[PDB]
Amino acid sequence: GNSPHELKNAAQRAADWLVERQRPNGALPSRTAVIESCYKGMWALHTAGHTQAASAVADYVTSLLQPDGDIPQPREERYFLDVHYLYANGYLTIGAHVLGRFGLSRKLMSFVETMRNPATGGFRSHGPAIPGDGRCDSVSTSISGLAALYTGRVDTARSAADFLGSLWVGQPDRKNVFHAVADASGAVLTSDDAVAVQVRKAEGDWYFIGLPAFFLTALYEATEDRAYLDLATDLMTYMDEDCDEDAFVDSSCGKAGVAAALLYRLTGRPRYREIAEGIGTLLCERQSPYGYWSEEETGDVADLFWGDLDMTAEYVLWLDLIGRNLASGERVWA
Amino acid sequence: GNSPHELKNAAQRAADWLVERQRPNGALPSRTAVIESCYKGMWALHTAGHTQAASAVADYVTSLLQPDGDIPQPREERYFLDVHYLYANGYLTIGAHVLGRFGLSRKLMSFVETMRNPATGGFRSHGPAIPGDGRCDSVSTSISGLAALYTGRVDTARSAADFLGSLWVGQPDRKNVFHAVADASGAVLTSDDAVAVQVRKAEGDWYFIGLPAFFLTALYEATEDRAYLDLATDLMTYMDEDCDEDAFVDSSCGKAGVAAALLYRLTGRPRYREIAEGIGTLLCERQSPYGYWSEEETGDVADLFWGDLDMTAEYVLWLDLIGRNLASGERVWA
Numbered sequence: 080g081n082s083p084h085e086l087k088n089a090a091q092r093a094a095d096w097l098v099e100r101q102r103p104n105g106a107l108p109s110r111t112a113v114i115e116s117c118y119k120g121m122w123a124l125h126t127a128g129h130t131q132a133a134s135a136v137a138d139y140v141t142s143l144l145q146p147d148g149d150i151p152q153p154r155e156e157r158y159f160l161d162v163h164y165l166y167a168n169g170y171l172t173i174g175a176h177v178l179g180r181f182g183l184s185r186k187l188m189s190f191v192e193t194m195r196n197p198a199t200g201g202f203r204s205h206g207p208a209i210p211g212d213g214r215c216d217s218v219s220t221s222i223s224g225l226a227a228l229y230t231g232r233v234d235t236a237r238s239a240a241d242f243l244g245s246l247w248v249g250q251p252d253r254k255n256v257f258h259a260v261a262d263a264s265g266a267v268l269t270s271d272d273a274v275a276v277q278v279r280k281a282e283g284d285w286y287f288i289g290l291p292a293f294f295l296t297a298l299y300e301a302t303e304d305r306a307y308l309d310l311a312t313d314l315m316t317y318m319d320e321d322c323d324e325d326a327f328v329d330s331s332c333g334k335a336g337v338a339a340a341l342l343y344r345l346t347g348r349p350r351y352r353e354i355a356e357g358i359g360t361l362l363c364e365r366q367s368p369y370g371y372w373s374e375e376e377t378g379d380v381a382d383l384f385w386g387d388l389d390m391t392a393e394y395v396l397w398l399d400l401i402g403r404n405l406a407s408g409e410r411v412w413a
Numbered sequence: 414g415n416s417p418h419e420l421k422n423a424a425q426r427a428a429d430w431l432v433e434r435q436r437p438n439g440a441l442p443s444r445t446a447v448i449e450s451c452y453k454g455m456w457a458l459h460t461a462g463h464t465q466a467a468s469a470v471a472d473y474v475t476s477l478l479q480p481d482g483d484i485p486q487p488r489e490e491r492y493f494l495d496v497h498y499l500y501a502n503g504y505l506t507i508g509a510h511v512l513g514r515f516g517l518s519r520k521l522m523s524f525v526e527t528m529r530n531p532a533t534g535g536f537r538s539h540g541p542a543i544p545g546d547g548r549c550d551s552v553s554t555s556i557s558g559l560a561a562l563y564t565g566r567v568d569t570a571r572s573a574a575d576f577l578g579s580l581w582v583g584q585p586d587r588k589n590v591f592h593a594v595a596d597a598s599g600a601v602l603t604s605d606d607a608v609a610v611q612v613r614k615a616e617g618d619w620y621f622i623g624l625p626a627f628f629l630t631a632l633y634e635a636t637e638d639r640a641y642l643d644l645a646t647d648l649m650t651y652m653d654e655d656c657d658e659d660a661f662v663d664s665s666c667g668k669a670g671v672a673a674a675l676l677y678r679l680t681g682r683p684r685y686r687e688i689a690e691g692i693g694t695l696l697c698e699r700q701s702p703y704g705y706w707s708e709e710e711t712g713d714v715a716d717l718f719w720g721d722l723d724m725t726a727e728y729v730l731w732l733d734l735i736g737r738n739l740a741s742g743e744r745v746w747a
């Protein structure tokens with residue numbers, strides 16, 4: 080595979096591509112003005128050293144911030160309304176905090192906490208303005224727990240991990256389907272309108288497993304509580320041995336790649352290095368010659384569909400995180 | 414005056430210089446192997462986007478970590494023994510946390526908090542192996558408060574601010590001297606052996622005032638409590654109007670520059686922009702063409718004495734922080 084330096088080089092070229100096209104108000108170059116086009120922008124650009132561009136995204140995000148600490152608009156994609164509303168808020172919180180925008184991160188994180196279910200520790204899938212039944216999903220919960228870790232709200236993160244453990248233990252038929260959603264009481268939801276990963280098919284949505292694995296590994300690093308490492312380990316084993324090969328190939332495999340790279344640094348287990356290396360190389364090989372990522376776009380374009388802009392920022396982050404955990408893991412274990 | 418982009422470009426040249434000379438275990442190229450040569454390295458290199466190099470510093474720091482969460486050795490400079498012991502620990506905590514090394518940041522910050530005076534909110538000036546009288550100083554307290562902000566221990570940060578307010582109110586002769594130390598009871602220490610800035614002379618040590626100003630501004634950003642903004646602006650106006658011109662010229666003026674840049678973004682007051690621009694430009698002007706900063710050396714050296722290496726990482730950080738707060742302040746206020 081490719082070396083940590085090569086993975087980082089790919090991330091930097093994509094970051095440069097984004098910053099060259101950033102708008103004067105700080106928005107990233109999306110064909111639609113929606114928060115789901117740039118929610119990873121602060122954190123990704125900061126990791127690439129583009130701190131003025133990252134702070135410009137913070138300025139743009141601050142201009143959207145409502146008195147309750149939410150960014151309810153502009154939102155268009157249904158997954159950011161009633162599947163995992165808080166997916167945007169979680170990365171916004173992390174990016175703001177690492178930038179030292181402590182007022183923005185406090186306000187964002189305090190809103191995120193209002194959508195926690197205090198009975199289960201899960202985080203509600205649908206936003207305040209979106210009618211729903213109080214269901215909570217693995218992605219809202221994992222990203223909110225990760226934002227809790229970055230902002231030092233470790234008890235909130237521990238509670239999120241409790242929910243993930245209940246969701247995992249409660250699976251009715253895990254060898255065929257991962258039901259990523261629970262009802263407001265914590266029972267796993269199997270209705271057709273609830274996210275379900277067909278683990279024996281090559282149809283994506285693997286990040287509903289991979290993001291929990293990454294969060295739980297970071298929580299273990301923060302706490303040294305082996306219960307969290309055990310659950311992250313079980314989820315990685317699930318993806319590696321019970322899931323279709325698409326789990327480490329689909330566009331959403333970066334989350335599992337990052338979890339694997341962190342688990343390698345913490346445990347030294349070579350399978351984790353192999354998983355992270357393979358995913359990092361795959362993402363590197365799919366990069367356009369210009370710097371962005373897209374499964375369809377092939378030209379020298381000035382902007383991107385929101386999903387490709389999000390993917391481009393996401394892969395800046397995943398390649399950086401994989402690269403630094405592989406490099407330090409090699410120093411520690413090899 | 415240099416533009417925010419130019420300040421950042423200077424930081425990046427220095428960061429490249431450091432990374433090119435980094436040692437295989439992650440230590441930075443110091444002529445002596447001491448923690449005071451590299452304590453700002455994790456945070457500085459991360460801000461520059463050199464996350465693998467920053468993680469390598471974290472690996473080195475982790476290998477020195479003792480069971481109590483301290484790094485008592487290697488230390489040689491007396492200021493890092495009995496004047497502001499925790500100055501090293503504070504930057505290590507911040508750099509570890511921003512990298513997501515949550516076990517490292519938890520352990521470092523927990524040790525820092527064992528040195529807090531629960532009656533005054535100050536942090537003890539002398540480390541565990543160093544005898545002393547329990548005195549607490551403004552630099553130990555402000556960097557520990559900033560580390561508390563980054564790790565989410567906001568009550569600790571508020572207590573640190575209380576100590577700084579008491580120190581400021583209790584000054585017996587602020588026109589001539591800033592007494593930066595209080596005894597274990599919280600009373601300002603005026604004895605011959607306690608750090609004191611000669612504010613009407615050009616003799617340095619201005620960061621005993623400038624770092625509190627930076628920390629208090631960050632705490633105001635985190636809480637919106639105008640009491641902290643008022644104290645921060647008291648300190649800035651003190652340095653601007655009552656202190657020697659050296660306060661904005663000495664090698665330690667970068668802390669005040671960062672405080673001014675943040676105050677400009679938060680308040681729009683043009684004088685703060687002027688102070689930050691002036692300090693940023695002065696630091697850029699002093700940079701070696703080869704990328705480092707040094708009090709005495711010029712030309713293409715392979716390494717630096719610890720104080721110059723510390724100053725080089727420090728100015729990566731300050732130029733980056735000044736640049737991004739000036740850039741965002743211009744966006745917000747114009």
Ligand SMILES: *[C@@H](O)[C@@H](C[C@H](O)[C@H](O)CO)NC(C)=O
Pocket residue numbers: 158286330331332385386387389390393
């Ligand atoms: C994980 O972030 C996954 C998110 C979804 O694709 C978003 O809803 C659209 O960007 N990312 C990828 C690249 O699959």
Ligand SMILES: *[C@@H](O)[C@@H](C[C@H](O)[C@H](O)CO)NC(C)=O
Pocket residue numbers: 492620664665666720723724727
């Ligand atoms: C503030 O960090 C100041 C610290 C003192 O110089 C240290 O005691 C020695 O590095 N930095 C500078 C550049 O003045």
